[PDB]
C-alpha cells in the first residue's frame, strides 16, 4: 500500500466545494473563539465542551468529532503536557499559568472543517508562549507552500524549516512530535494523503488549484516521543514537557493559500 494514497493528485475542490467548506470551517472558527472566551482559571474542560457544542449546533452543523471512532465529546481539550485528544472532563479544571490547546470539527451539508489552536491560561509562562508562537509559525509556514504544482512533502518541509526558523528566533530547540500529522479533508474528516510535519521535499502526491489539507504542527519544549494514557485517548509528551498544537484546514487556489476555518 502507498503511504500516501492511491491518487497523483489530491483531490481538487470546485470553488462551490470550497465555498461549502469553508461555511462548515466558519462554524469551527466560531467555536474555538467560544471556547477561548470560556476558557478561565477555574473552569472545567467539559464546561468548554458544552461552548463548543451548542455554537457547532446553533449554527446548523453538527461536531464531528462526537461519537468519532467511540471519542465522547465535541472538542479534544489537551493541557500542558497533553498534545492531542485530550478528553473534556467536569475534574480537568484550568488553573493560571495553563497551556491549553483546543481541538475541533463540524460537518455542515456532509462538509468537513478541522482547526486547533493553543493559549494560555491567566499569565503565560515565557517558554510556553514560545512554544505556541513556534507552532503557530510552523503553520503559518506550511500555510505558504500550499501553491499549484508543489509536492506533499514540499509543505512537510516547510513546516519542518518554520520549526527550525523559530527555534532561531526563541533561541530554544522544539520537539517535532512524532508519529502525528495533517491529512486531507472533504466529506470525511480523515482522508488521505497523511501530511507529515517533517521530511525531504518533492514526496507524494502534487497538489493544484482547489486542493484541501488540513495543516496542523504540533511542537514541545522537549522529546519528540509520546504514550497514549490509561484513558486510550489522551496523547501525553513521555518526558512531561509541555506541548502545543496548531491547525487549519487550507486549499490551493489561483490566488494563494485559503484558510477555509476563518474565525470571526
Ligand atoms: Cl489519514
Ligand atoms: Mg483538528
Ligand atoms: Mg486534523
Ligand atoms: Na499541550
Request: one cysteine or more; a negative charge.
Amino acid at each position: 500500500v502507498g503511504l500516501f494514497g492511491r491518487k497523483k493528485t489530491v483531490e481538487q475542490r470546485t470553488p462551490g466545494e470550497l465555498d461549502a467548506m469553508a461555511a462548515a470551517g466558519s462554524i469551527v472558527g466560531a467555536a474555538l473563539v467560544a471556547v477561548r472566551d470560556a476558557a478561565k482559571a477555574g473552569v472545567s474542560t467539559l464546561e468548554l465542551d458544552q461552548v463548543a457544542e451548542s455554537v457547532i449546533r446553533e449554527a446548523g452543523a453538527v461536531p464531528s468529532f462526537l461519537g468519532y471512532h467511540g471519542f465522547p465529546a465535541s472538542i479534544c481539550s489537551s493541557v500542558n503536557d497533553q498534545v492531542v485528544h485530550g478528553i473534556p472532563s467536569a475534574t480537568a479544571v484550568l488553573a493560571d499559568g495553563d497551556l491549553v490547546s483546543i481541538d475541533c470539527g463540524a460537518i455542515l451539508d456532509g462538509w468537513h472543517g478541522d482547526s486547533a489552536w493553543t493559549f494560555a491560561v491567566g499569565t503565560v509562562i515565557p517558554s510556553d508562549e514560545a512554544l505556541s508562537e513556534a507552532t503557530r509559525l510552523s503553520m503559518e509556514a506550511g500555510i505558504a507552500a500550499m501553491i499549484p504544482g508543489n509536492r506533499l512533502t514540499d509543505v512537510s518541509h516547510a513546516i519542518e524549516l518554520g520549526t527550525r526558523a523559530a527555534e532561531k528566533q526563541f533561541d530554544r530547540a522544539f520537539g517535532i512530535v512524532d508519529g502525528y500529522g495533517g491529512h486531507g479533508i472533504g466529506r470525511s474528516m480523515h482522508l488521505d494523503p497523511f501530511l507529515p510535519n517533517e521530511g525531504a521535499p518533492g514526496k507524494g502526491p502534487l497538489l493544484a488549484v482547489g486542493s484541501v489539507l488540513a495543516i496542523e504542527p504540533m511542537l514541545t519544549l522537549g522529546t519528540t516521543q509520546t504514550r497514549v494514557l490509561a484513558d486510550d485517548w489522551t496523547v501525553v509528551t513521555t518526558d512531561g514537557s509541555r506541548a502545543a498544537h496548531w491547525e487549519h484546514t487550507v486549499a490551493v487556489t489561483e490566488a494563494g493559500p485559503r484558510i477555509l476555518t476563518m474565525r470571526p
